[PDB]
Enzyme design. Structure first.
Site, short mmCIF file in Angstrom:
data_model
loop_
_atom_site.label_atom_id
_atom_site.label_comp_id
_atom_site.label_asym_id
_atom_site.label_seq_id
_atom_site.Cartn_x
_atom_site.Cartn_y
_atom_site.Cartn_z
N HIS A 1 0.83 -1.24 0.00
CA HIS A 1 0.00 0.00 0.00
C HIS A 1 0.85 1.26 0.00
CE1 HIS A 1 -3.19 -2.89 1.11
NE2 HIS A 1 -3.86 -2.12 0.23
N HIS B 1 1.74 1.56 -5.74
CA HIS B 1 0.32 1.11 -5.86
C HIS B 1 -0.56 2.27 -6.33
CE1 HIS B 1 -3.47 -0.82 -5.00
NE2 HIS B 1 -3.77 0.11 -4.14
N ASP C 1 -8.14 -0.86 -8.48
CA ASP C 1 -7.49 -1.21 -7.20
C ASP C 1 -6.99 -2.64 -7.21
OD1 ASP C 1 -6.58 -0.60 -4.64
OD2 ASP C 1 -8.53 -1.13 -3.74
N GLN D 1 -5.53 -17.66 -3.45
CA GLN D 1 -5.59 -16.85 -4.69
C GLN D 1 -6.77 -17.34 -5.56
OE1 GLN D 1 -3.85 -13.84 -5.78
NE2 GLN D 1 -3.89 -13.95 -3.56
N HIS E 1 -6.01 7.35 -3.35
CA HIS E 1 -7.07 6.48 -2.78
C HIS E 1 -6.55 5.75 -1.56
CE1 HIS E 1 -5.14 3.16 -4.74
NE2 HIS E 1 -5.88 2.34 -4.03
N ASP E 2 -5.23 5.62 -1.38
CA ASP E 2 -4.69 4.89 -0.18
C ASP E 2 -3.73 5.80 0.61
OD1 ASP E 2 -5.77 2.17 0.07
OD2 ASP E 2 -4.50 1.52 -1.61
#
Ligand SMILES: Cn1cc(-c2ccccc2)nc1COc1nc2ccccc2nc1Cl
Ligand SMILES: [Mg+2]
Ligand SMILES: [Zn+2]
Length: 313
Positions: free
Chosen positions: A68, A72, A217, A269, A106-107
């Site tokens: 993060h 990213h 994202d 995953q 956004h983060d």
């Protein structure tokens, strides 16, 4: 005014593709972003000096965490750029402006911990924001930076355009809370299949922008296999640190966050591609057909995780 950003030839061509990787040269990421604003929005959208000061203050407010991080942010903005460039006429001027900025921001100030961990820790942010805890903080940090002297990139907008763009950015950032994605996609699924989907209905646009935000994202699952596989290491480095921190609070973490259960990553995953990623890109493709390469790349990566389980790698 007459000052384009230009990229080397390989980057100039590949940046247009959904599966583009921004590379390991951190100092090129700001220029790559400005390039994308200039082609997505225009050379006129933002004063270059203000935009440059905005980008560098945003960078400074991302932390040195494994996933993060600033990389990213720029990666998620590039996925948005590719969606916008492949759907030229579907989006308003204000939307093109807001969404690249929303993706970059956004983060903001992420710590590498989930909303769940903050609530269990009893972090102050969990008292200030009872749902979408980190995402309300990411929006709060975006408004802070926009309010620093010389950082107001939207200063040429009217009062009501400014309110509209900040509302596009708030909703875009809130939608990156994956807890909200499942319901948003079911409603989009129903709307598309009963034929009620209407892109003139603001509340419909909101939902479609939210799914775009989920798609950008999660875009690590839409890269070429070696990028996807190496990014997965960064994602799990955070999850496993959170698991360690849950064990410090006297809480067995979920298996996904327990490093003692590394062996079960390939099956985890699989669940995520089947329960989250594939459904996401499938509904996005139905609404915006030119985003189909994202679904095709996700499918290819699911098939690669299936090969890992079968000991074929
Ligand atoms: C769902 N799940 C369960 C497990 C697991 C792993 C080991 C042992 C037991 C369970 N791994 C996952 C994968 O989860 C995610 N992968 C992402 C990949 C890319 C971008 C966002 C993601 N977000 C999430 Cl939540
Ligand atoms: Mg987030
Ligand atoms: Zn994110």
């Amino acid at each position: 005014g007459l000052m384009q950003f230009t990229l080397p030839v390989r980057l100039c061509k590949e940046i247009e593709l959904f599966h583009f990787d921004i590379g390991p040269f951190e100092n090129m990421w700001p220029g790559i972003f400005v390039y994308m604003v200039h082609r997505s929005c225009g050379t006129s959208c933002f004063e270059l000096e203000k935009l440059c000061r905005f980008i560098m203050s945003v960078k400074k407010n991302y932390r040195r965490v494994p996933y993060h991080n600033w990389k990213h942010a720029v990666t998620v903005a590039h996925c948005m750029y590719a969606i916008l460039q492949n759907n030229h006429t579907l989006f308003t001027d204000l939307e093109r402006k807001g969404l690249l900025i929303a993706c970059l921001c956004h983060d903001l100030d992420h710590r590498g911990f989930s909303n769940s961990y903050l609530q269990k820790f009893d972090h102050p942010l969990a008292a200030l924001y009872s749902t979408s805890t980190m995402e309300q903080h990411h929006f709060s940090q975006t408004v802070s930076i926009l309010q620093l002297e010389g950082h107001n990139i939207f200063s040429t907008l009217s009062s009501s355009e400014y309110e509209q763009v900040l509302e596009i950015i708030r909703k875009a950032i809130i939608a990156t809370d994956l807890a909200l994605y499942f319901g948003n996609r079911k409603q989009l699924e129903e709307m598309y299949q009963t034929g009620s989907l209407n892109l003139n209905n603001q509340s419909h646009r909101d939902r479609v922008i939210g799914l775009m935000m989920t798609a950008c994202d999660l875009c690590s699952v839409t890269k070429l296999w070696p990028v996807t596989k190496l990014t997965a290491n960064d994602i799990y480095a955070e999850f496993w640190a959170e698991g360690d921190e849950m064990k410090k609070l006297g809480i067995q973490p979920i298996p996904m966050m327990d490093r003692d259960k590394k062996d079960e990553v390939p099956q985890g995953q699989l669940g995520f591609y089947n329960a989250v990623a594939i459904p996401c890109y499938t509904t996005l493709t139905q609404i915006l057909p030119p985003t189909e390469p994202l679904l095709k790349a996700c499918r290819d990566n699911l098939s690669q995780w299936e090969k890992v389980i079968r000991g074929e790698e």
